[PDB]
């Protein structure tokens, strides 16, 4: 049971205990009541179930998904925007927090993408990905690869296929329509077409992944990466020349990947919600409480201009930054997941050969429409 004097904290997959155990143990200690946290493994799984009976944790951290899960269901006590931290942190986060006109959440934690370049290898980073592939040519007589992207992934097949024109969905009006989109006509096929081109081309191998060019980066064998969050593992700039940017152009459309965003809320059963809001917005949303969690892991970055701009300070982050000012937040609902899966199967049937572009491309559009 909830009882005042203590309260239940579920963080998000992106750390166990350590991270909220440290802000909400000095926490317990400055107010002297109780900070129980628990795994995310039972958060997604439990919170639901939990909510049926009326007991269980006092505040839920999250993503994207809970967002909609615990504001439609009614799961949660409505909280109201602070004009203060709102300066402090973005006004689009609050978007994100936002629901019914009624704020659902906090922004706790902020994950972006952006294009990772060897100033080393290369004089000037890329403006068109149309320079890549070509360039993966020329440095490859050095021995070296241009840009590392993981093919057989959703991540990249959406912005390949969706720049020259192979939207998986039509957006309008704030609608969407599954109905009317973008793949079944002739510039998805276009997608496939240019896809297969360099990995055809056996510009990576199918081993090839994100990690590997993070540590190809140590010897300056590959000369740029695609990555976001991740990048904590190895990349910065220290004795070398590194630099980074966010994504470029393909065929006159933004590789600008999508914007994600922590998003805390105060549970509607809990009878701690003014404790356990306050110290939400104002402690962990603080440059010493989200410092106190990065510090034992990298997060990745925060809403909050204080540390935002601290942490910033390592060039993994600094583009990325500028993707989420610049991107939007999950904003390509629950449909766009399949949609990619959908899309993703098709560039592995074109590149393997077992399919033509007509068969896998009219494969993909129809998985998306089906």
Same mark, same amino acid.
């Given at each position: 049971?909830?009882?005042?004097?203590?309260?239940?904290?579920?963080?998000?997959?992106?750390?166990?205990?350590?991270?909220?155990?440290?802000?909400?143990?000095?926490?317990?200690?400055?107010?002297?009541?109780?900070?129980?946290?628990?795994?995310?493994?039972?958060?997604?799984?439990?919170?639901?179930?939990?909510?049926?009976?009326?007991?269980?944790?006092?505040?839920?951290?999250?993503?994207?998904?809970?967002?909609?899960?615990?504001?439609?269901?009614?799961?949660?006590?409505?909280?109201?925007?602070?004009?203060?931290?709102?300066?402090?942190?973005?006004?689009?986060?609050?978007?994100?927090?936002?629901?019914?006109?009624?704020?659902?959440?906090?922004?706790?934690?902020?994950?972006?993408?952006? =294009? /990772?370049? @060897? %100033?080393?290898?290369?004089?000037?980073?890329?403006?068109?990905?149309? !320079?890549?592939?070509?360039?993966?040519? &020329?440095?490859?007589?050095?021995?070296?690869?241009?840009?590392?992207?993981?093919?057989?992934?959703?991540?990249?097949?959406?912005?390949?296929?969706?720049?020259?024109?192979?939207?998986?969905?039509?957006?309008?009006?704030?609608?969407?329509?599954?109905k009317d989109v973008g793949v079944d006509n002739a510039g998805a096929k276009a997608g496939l077409t240019?896809?297969?081109? =360099? /990995?055809? @081309? %056996?510009?990576?191998?199918?081993?090839?992944?994100?990690?590997?060019? !993070?540590?190809?980066?140590?010897?300056? &064998?590959?000369?740029?990466?695609?990555?976001?969050?991740?990048?904590?593992?190895?990349?910065?700039?220290?004795?070398?020349?590194?630099?980074?940017?966010?994504?470029?152009?393909?065929?006159?459309?933004?590789?600008?990947?999508?914007?994600?965003?922590?998003?805390?809320?105060?549970?509607?059963?809990?009878?701690?919600?003014?404790?356990?809001?306050?110290?939400?917005?104002?402690?962990?949303?603080?440059?010493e409480g989200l410092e106190a969690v990065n510090k034992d892991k990298p997060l990745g970055a925060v809403?909050?201009?204080?540390?935002?701009?601290?942490?910033?300070?390592?060039?993994?982050?600094?583009?990325?930054?500028?993707?989420?000012?610049?991107?939007?937040?999950?904003?390509?609902?629950?449909?766009?997941?399949?949609?990619?899966?959908?899309?993703?199967?098709?560039?592995?049937?074109?590149?393997?050969?077992?399919?033509?572009?007509?068969?896998?491309?009219?494969?993909?559009?129809?998985?998306?429409?089906?």
């Open positions: 049971k909830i009882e005042e004097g203590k309260l239940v904290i579920w963080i998000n997959g992106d750390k166990g205990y350590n991270g909220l155990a440290e802000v909400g143990k000095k926490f317990e200690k400055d107010t002297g009541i109780k900070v129980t946290v628990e795994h995310p493994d039972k958060l997604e799984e439990k919170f639901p179930q939990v909510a049926a009976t009326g007991d269980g944790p006092d505040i839920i951290f999250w993503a994207h998904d809970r967002f909609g899960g615990y504001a439609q269901s009614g799961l949660l006590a409505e909280i109201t925007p602070d004009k203060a931290f709102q300066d402090k942190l973005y006004p689009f986060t609050w978007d994100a927090v936002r629901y019914n006109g009624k704020l659902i959440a906090y922004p706790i934690a902020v994950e972006a993408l952006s =294009l /990772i370049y @060897n %100033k080393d290898l290369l004089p000037n980073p890329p403006k068109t990905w149309e !320079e890549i592939p070509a360039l993966d040519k &020329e440095l490859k007589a050095k021995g070296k690869s241009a840009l590392m992207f993981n093919l057989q992934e959703p991540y990249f097949t959406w912005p390949l296929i969706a720049a020259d024109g192979g939207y998986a969905f039509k957006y309008e009006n704030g609608k969407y329509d599954i240019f896809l297969v081109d =360099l /990995i055809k @081309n %056996k510009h990576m191998n199918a081993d090839t992944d994100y990690s590997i060019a !993070e540590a190809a980066f140590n010897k300056g &064998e590959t000369a740029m990466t695609i990555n976001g969050p991740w990048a904590w593992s190895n990349i910065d700039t220290s004795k070398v020349n590194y630099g980074v940017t966010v994504l470029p152009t393909f065929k006159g459309q933004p590789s600008k990947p999508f914007v994600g965003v922590l998003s805390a809320g105060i549970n509607a059963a809990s009878p701690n919600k003014e404790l356990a809001k306050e110290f939400l917005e104002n402690y962990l949303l603080t440059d809403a909050l201009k204080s540390y935002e701009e601290e942490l910033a300070k390592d060039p993994r982050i600094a583009a990325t930054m500028e993707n989420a000012q610049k991107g939007e937040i999950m904003p390509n609902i629950p449909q766009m997941s399949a949609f990619w899966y959908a899309v993703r199967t098709a560039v592995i049937n074109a590149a393997s050969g077992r399919q033509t572009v007509d068969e896998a491309l009219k494969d993909a559009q129809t998985r998306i429409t089906k």
